[PDB]
Design a protein around this ligand. Sequence first.
Ligand SMILES: Nc1ncnc2c1ncn2[C@@H]1O[C@H](COP(=O)(O)OP(=O)(O)OP(=O)(O)O)[C@@H](O)[C@H]1O
Ligand SMILES: Nc1ncnc2c1ncn2[C@@H]1O[C@H](COP(=O)(O)OP(=O)(O)OP(=O)(O)O)[C@@H](O)[C@H]1O
Ligand SMILES: Nc1ncnc2c1ncn2[C@@H]1O[C@H](COP(=O)(O)OP(=O)(O)OP(=O)(O)O)[C@@H](O)[C@H]1O
Lengths: 97, 99, 97
Amino acid sequence: MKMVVAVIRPEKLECVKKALEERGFVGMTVTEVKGRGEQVDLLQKTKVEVVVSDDAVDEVVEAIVSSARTGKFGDGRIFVIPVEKSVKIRTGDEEVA
Amino acid sequence: MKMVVAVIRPEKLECVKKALEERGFVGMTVTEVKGRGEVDLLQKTKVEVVVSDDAVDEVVEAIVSSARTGKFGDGRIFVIPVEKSVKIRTGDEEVAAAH
Amino acid sequence: MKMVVAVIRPEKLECVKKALEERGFVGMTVTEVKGRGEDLLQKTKVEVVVSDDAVDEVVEAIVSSARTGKFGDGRIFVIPVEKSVKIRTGDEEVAAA
Ligand SMILES: Nc1ncnc2c1ncn2[C@@H]1O[C@H](COP(=O)(O)OP(=O)(O)OP(=O)(O)O)[C@@H](O)[C@H]1O
Ligand SMILES: Nc1ncnc2c1ncn2[C@@H]1O[C@H](COP(=O)(O)OP(=O)(O)OP(=O)(O)O)[C@@H](O)[C@H]1O
Ligand SMILES: Nc1ncnc2c1ncn2[C@@H]1O[C@H](COP(=O)(O)OP(=O)(O)OP(=O)(O)O)[C@@H](O)[C@H]1O
């Protein structure tokens, strides 16, 4: 399992949500953040976290890249982090790699 | 070490906080988030606790029991590896086994 | 690649920002959080994704600029990052082998 962490322009949230939903990726956690790159320096950004299985990573990344890009500086970054265990609170069932 | 990341109902924060504290897990970082899985995005609470490998199951069980309602939307817990843990005050760094 | 996650006192943000910028680490994501250690108080989360060899330099920069010597100075967590993608170009940064 992997956690796909994307930091995008706030106005692109709806595009990213739809591009994900269309491909069958309905689960997500969204956080309001601030940041800067090689560009008051800290500007408003949006963080989208999606936990998926290993094989779905490239599809999720391609969905975010296509829906979040503008071609201008400040489009954002996607970070892929390993997830060793995923637990459903309701049932107590644990998904392990 | 591992980072236990739990996304819970905002009203369950006090239960989770109290449950973790009882078991000796006092250190935690809390973030106000939004999410979906099944208005669109709904208000949720993210609780992050960095613990040693052997304490993971106990931390997960503490969160599961205190955050549960039996209804859909109870939340998820994600376990992430932590390679280095640094205490700012002393500069002391905690590193995982082997090498 | 690694993600350096620092949880600091909110008043130390400008120090940390400057200390990282001086060393060439301009890219960062900041989140307003709450927490406790050894009663949930306002804290600042700073995330910086860097290459493996730059980790120690980044950690030392944060430690020196964020410390006060008093309890509540915070923690730095180092998390592995398998892939880093630039949304604008679609270019992927991975560790060779
Ligand atoms: N190394 C990094 N670590 C953590 N967050 C980062 C990093 N680099 C960028 N970010 C985050 O992604 C957001 C967008 O950064 P972005 O790199 O796209 O800006 P940039 O200066 O215009 O460069 P470019 O589009 O050419 O890569 C930042 O505001 C910040 O929140
Ligand atoms: N795959 C995922 N990646 C990231 N965050 C997720 C994912 N799945 C769920 N979440 C987060 O967890 C919260 C709860 O998700 P969900 O709607 O599936 O309810 P649940 O309690 O996890 O599961 P269930 O519907 O089976 O009871 C969401 O609002 C979202 O913040
Ligand atoms: N184990 C942990 N897991 C997650 N976040 C933590 C953890 N420990 C501390 N934090 C975060 O770092 C912040 C600062 O904690 P800190 O450790 O500096 O306080 P303290 O424990 O009272 O003092 P000290 O570490 O010097 O004994 C907390 O408010 C919380 O947001």
